[PDB]
Ligand binder design. Structure first.
Ligand SMILES: *Cc1c(COP(=O)(O)O)cnc(C)c1O
Ligand SMILES: *Cc1c(COP(=O)(O)O)cnc(C)c1O
Lengths: 396, 396
């Protein structure tokens, strides 16, 4: 039965992590996958997280199955983070959230749900976008169409191209928007731009789907949620696939959420019963550990104060590395002006390196970046900045 | 977009857990979902598990993403449990395993993989079988056909009906077999019967898919794996979706595995690259906590000795409850002879109660059983045995 199965191509992000592993070179540098590193080049378990974990170790009395949708408190805390504490969506009971295995799990559950319960056949994704978006949607059997976004020449969000590209989107299509800290460009719309978009979707009949994986990495928790909140106020319906992998440094515990919003309580509960059926036919119910760590921290004021500071430290450290990167490139003779990278948000900077330069960097210098030229600024430290900047100016 | 979504019907197993929750009756009894209970009617975290968890709390230094296929050691320990320590499959590198979110996750990954990479269009499941099998396979777009199994009249495995039913299965179809402790009947084939089946699949060209969720609940770890091992010796290809939810009491951490076996190392690695692609487009990578607990215990001799005894205690306690159940029914005037239940293996006994009796039990007496008449013997305790047996004889 398997004789003719052809090998799948390596994952552009995750397979990169393998090559780097197998690399016996001493000075190799990561920069590929979106995982935070501290000053020492390590990815430690957050202190608020370690504390919540002892708490769970001393307090859990059972590992009995959670319901299909997970821990209720987790769901509530998630909605408050997303929409705000006194949100009308929350007060009118217009939103239901299911705990899922990571943000990817949330996107797939959203896809399966839409493919099986609505008339959706098309999902619009930005050019460029997280490479795995296409795979997830194609998996549920939906086609992916792409909308213009990035202006490679000016390193700006080409807004008119974005709008004119979206005019080919029909009423009933799904349009995918990144929350804030666009992966891979780091270029995001202004609040004014988010409002224009919110009113155009409403007028055009698009169903917004937000992939929110970096809440807290641009300006703050509540600020980073402004685009989505702009949208939540206008729309009767929307879905949010959020992730706690990055903002809680909980990557491998698989903590995410799929939030479904409908015009009313009655409709959303009915639509949610089908979302639950899609989950049962997939992984049954979600993994408790990571999600209970998140609920514990968000529900406890002392633990929450510690986590918020840890997140602030991650954010600030990345901001410092960005400046450090553009300066060092300059003082190493990387003649090209890389100042636009200071203008990007989040863990990543879209460097503008070509497929071949990205390839040479690795084979000749052992510094690993995604083939699209996307580099993980959070993977940079004061110690690896110079060898890294030295490799870059040499392939330029 | 969601105005016309119709509510999904409640899950026959998981939705039962909700009704029981919402039940304000004092003497209500569970018996529905397949979760073990000790003498006190609680589902404690195993002692070996609590210990492995402190170990992880003191020793983990990162939550960085696992690879798509999970923790390597987890994969190795799994293959040894399944095939045996000195297995030829293991030595010839004919098997690859991916850590997945529970056994359900493993079945779905197997389904997606088969639907997208092979010519499979049909999956044969036993009548009766775990209610969720149909949903998982239909989700990947495969149809489910059913083979005869249970003889309701004699409470036996109707073996000729099983064989004659399977003669309608074509070369290239998938045939699903339960490892041991068949859910829901508890009726399993003899080793001789397993050999006859192994040779018939090989001759007929069926691809065996084993759902192994109760390893250790019938006679022992290695004995319960005899049917599958009978099959592994004859087949060039097979897939195993195993679960550690029940045997490790790790229900909510979602710990399972999907093991792919091909004729050789080269073929299995190629087929596995596609399995990994199906995982990436689903939940990306697996949850670390439960799986590392399992690897820690299986890799440590002291921790393993404790766990094996805990599992032995669960097994024995269930065996005692079974005897207790048939005796108490007898001394309460449940005139029907329920002795066949002593002959069933695992957590469940297929009681033979009708849809309406199962329904009356709940509404009039608050004892919850699955509508098929399946009852969780592991949910019985010396304290609830009498009220339970009293309710049963009253609806008889
Ligand atoms: C990291 C990321 C994901 C994946 O989240 P997981 O929680 O790791 O599944 C999805 N979308 C975007 C834009 C991401 O950056
Ligand atoms: C319990 C069970 C499952 C589900 O396993 P999870 O690990 O809970 O996903 C699948 N198949 C059978 C036969 C089961 O008994």
């Amino acid at each position: 039965m398997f004789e003719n199965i052809t090998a799948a191509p390596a994952d552009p992000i995750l397979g990169l992590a393998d090559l780097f592993r197998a690399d016996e070179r001493p000075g190799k540098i990561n920069l590929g996958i979106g995982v935070y590193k501290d000053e020492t080049g390590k990815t430690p378990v957050l202190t608020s997280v370690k504390k919540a974990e002892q708490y769970l170790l001393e307090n859990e009395t059972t590992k009995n199955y959670l319901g299909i949708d997970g821990i209720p408190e987790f769901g509530r805390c998630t909605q408050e983070l997303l929409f705000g504490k006194g949100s009308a969506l929350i007060n009118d009971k217009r939103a239901r959230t299911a705990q899922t295995p990571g943000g990817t799990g949330a996107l797939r559950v959203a896809a399966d749900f839409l493919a099986k319960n609505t008339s959706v056949k098309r999902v619009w994704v930005s050019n460029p976008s997280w490479p795995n978006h296409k795979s997830v949607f194609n998996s549920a059997g939906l086609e992916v169409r792409e909308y213009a976004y990035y202006d490679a020449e000016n390193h700006t969000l080409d807004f008119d191209a974005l709008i004119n590209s979206l005019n080919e989107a029909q009423a009933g299509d799904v349009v995918l928007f990144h929350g804030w800290c666009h992966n891979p460009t780091g270029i995001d719309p202004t609040l004014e731009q988010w409002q224009t978009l919110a009113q155009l979707s409403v007028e055009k009949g698009w169903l917004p789907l937000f992939d929110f994986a970096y809440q807290g990495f641009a300006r703050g928790l509540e600020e980073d949620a402004e685009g989505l909140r702009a949208f939540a106020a206008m729309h009767k319906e929307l879905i949010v696939a959020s992730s706690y992998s990055k903002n809680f440094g909980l990557y491998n515990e698989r903590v995410g959420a799929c939030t479904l919003v409908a015009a009313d309580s009655e409709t959303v509960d009915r639509a949610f019963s089908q979302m639950k059926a899609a989950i049962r036919a997939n992984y049954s119910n979600p993994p408790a550990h990571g999600a209970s760590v998140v609920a514990t921290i968000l529900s406890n004021d002392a633990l929450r104060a510690i986590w918020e500071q840890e997140l602030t430290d991650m954010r600030q450290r990345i901001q410092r590395m960005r400046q450090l990167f553009v300066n060092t490139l300059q003082e190493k003779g990387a003649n090209r002006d890389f100042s636009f990278i200071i203008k990007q948000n989040g863990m990543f900077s879209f460097s503008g390196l070509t497929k071949e330069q990205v390839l040479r960097l690795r084979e000749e210098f052992g510094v690993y970046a995604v083939a699209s030229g996307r580099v993980n600024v959070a993977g940079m430290t004061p110690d690896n900045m110079a060898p890294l900047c030295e490799a870059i100016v040499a392939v330029l």
